[PDB]
């Protein structure tokens, strides 16, 4: 498995044409503020293809 390719799985809003977003902030899911921590209702935006 080659895990050197990633794709942004979670996003707050849709991406604009010809726009680049390289941030790795914690996706705010649900209603509990993540405040930077991961776990329940807080997923990582990037995911490996495998």
């Amino acid at each position, epitope marked *: 498995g080659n895990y050197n390719y990633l794709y942004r799985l979670f996003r707050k809003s849709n991406l604009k044409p010809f726009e680049r977003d390289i941030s790795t902030e914690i996706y705010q899911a649900g209603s509990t503020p993540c405040n*930077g921590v*991961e776990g329940f209702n807080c997923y*990582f935006p990037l995911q*490996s293809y495998g």
Partner: antibody
């Protein structure tokens, strides 16, 4: 469930390049970050650094910015640690933790630890 | 956020009473980001409480904590002989994670 198996103690000399391994079995290796924490005898814990396997980026501390070299093999699911110019006060128990992939995290799993004696 | 100091340090408590381990905050922990552990004699630490209020799956109900902005506690009721170890504090509200010195609970003989 996260069996973080490590290696044994290594008797080194003052000034070397140690290489401690940490077998990360159980769940996947890329969905969780890893951090190494030293434990000096009777001096609590100290966070040295952290590695992100999915991003291949490290975040060292102020006292290890340039000396510590923490890597992680994404094939054998093993995290490594390397430190250059080992001084006398480096005889601590190096633990292996599996932190989350966030800016703020806790050390939920741990390891058996390695009593790497440098001063010999 | 950088300094954690255990107030008791040592506590010779009877096997079955209640204990209180303090960890005073230094730089006004923002979102109650503190963690508790249990480092037994010659073993690895065990995660007990995250966020200073919520417990972990598998931890007995006797372990509990309280604290809002500058002082967190650890309320353990009816300490069994197995719960006699060193407990540390870890804050994750700032960028550099820091620890404390640890409080050793010994048997009251």
């Amino acid at each position: 469930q996260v069996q973080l198996v490590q290696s044994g103690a290594e008797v080194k000399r003052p000034g070397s390049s140690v290489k401690v391994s940490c077998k990360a079995s159980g769940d996947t290796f890329i969905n969780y970050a890893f951090s190494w924490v030293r434990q000096a005898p009777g001096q609590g814990l100290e966070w040295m650094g952290r590695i992100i396997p999915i991003l291949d980026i490290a975040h060292y501390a102020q006292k290890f910015q340039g000396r510590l070299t923490i890597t992680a093999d994404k094939s054998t699911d093993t995290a490594y640690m390397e430190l250059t110019s080992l001084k006398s006060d480096d005889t601590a128990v190096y633990f292996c933790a599996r932190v989350f992939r966030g800016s703020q995290y806790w050390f939920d799993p741990w390891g058996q630890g390695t009593l790497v004696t440098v001063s010999s | 956020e950088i300094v954690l100091t255990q107030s008791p340090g040592t506590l010779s408590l009877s096997p079955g009473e209640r204990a209180t381990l303090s960890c005073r905050a230094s730089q006004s922990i923002n979102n109650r980001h503190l963690a508790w552990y249990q480092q037994k004699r010659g073993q690895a630490p065990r995660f007990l409480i995250y966020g200073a209020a919520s417990r972990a799956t598998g931890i007995p109900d006797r372990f509990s904590g309280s604290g809002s902005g500058t002082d967190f506690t650890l309320t353990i009721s009816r300490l069994e002989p197995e719960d006699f170890a060193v407990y540390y504090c870890q804050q994750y509200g700032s960028s550099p994670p820091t620890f404390g010195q640890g409080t050793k609970v010994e048997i009251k003989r």
